[PDB]
Amino acid sequence: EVETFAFQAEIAQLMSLIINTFYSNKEIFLRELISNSSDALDKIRYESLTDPSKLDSGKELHINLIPNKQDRTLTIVDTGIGMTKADLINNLGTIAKSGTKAFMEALQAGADISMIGQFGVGFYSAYLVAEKVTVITKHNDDEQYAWESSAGGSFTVRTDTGEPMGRGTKVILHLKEDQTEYLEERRIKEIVKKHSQFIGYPITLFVEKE
């Protein structure tokens, strides 16, 4: 049912640096997640050129931002290419094809955490604002999976069946008590306008029911 894995040592070290480094400019987390979504959307768009059946799991190419003050979550949804189980475990749990090593060296030599996206590890900036991250994903060649981690060196993967998404990735950010500014409509719009105004897919900010 639930499988537990260790992060590769360098990934756990990087996460600990993000959790533990004093750094006020936390808002860049949202840019880095939107940018991974946009990348995943380019890839499905590209594939569907030579095989239009890749869109049978959904034609719309977009990014949805879903704040929920009651649950204290901000969720980033995209309809990009998604990840298989193996891709999820490698992509989130190992250095894989990222510049994890170069980033940690860079911060020692004067880079700052705002530059994390240059090294293909921008995802982990989620831990600037979230105590826990859940990544739900569905690739055309696999079943739906949920990855989850509150850091501390491990993560879990299980199958996810309540709510099939079609195709793509949802990142759910269980925000820290002091990071609820990122559920405010005004704050979200400001950050999207500041850092993500050129993304080439519709970004829809959901309104809250209460």
Ligand SMILES: O=S(=O)(Nc1ccc(O)c(-c2c(O)ccc3ccccc23)c1)c1cc(Cl)ccc1Cl
């Ligand atoms: O080039 S990618 O493989 N693109 C890609 C493909 C499918 C995906 O579902 C995603 C993706 C998303 O669509 C959304 C959030 C993600 C968070 C961490 C890693 C990948 C995410 C990104 C990739 C992989 C990694 Cl580990 C980090 C960034 C990127 Cl752009």
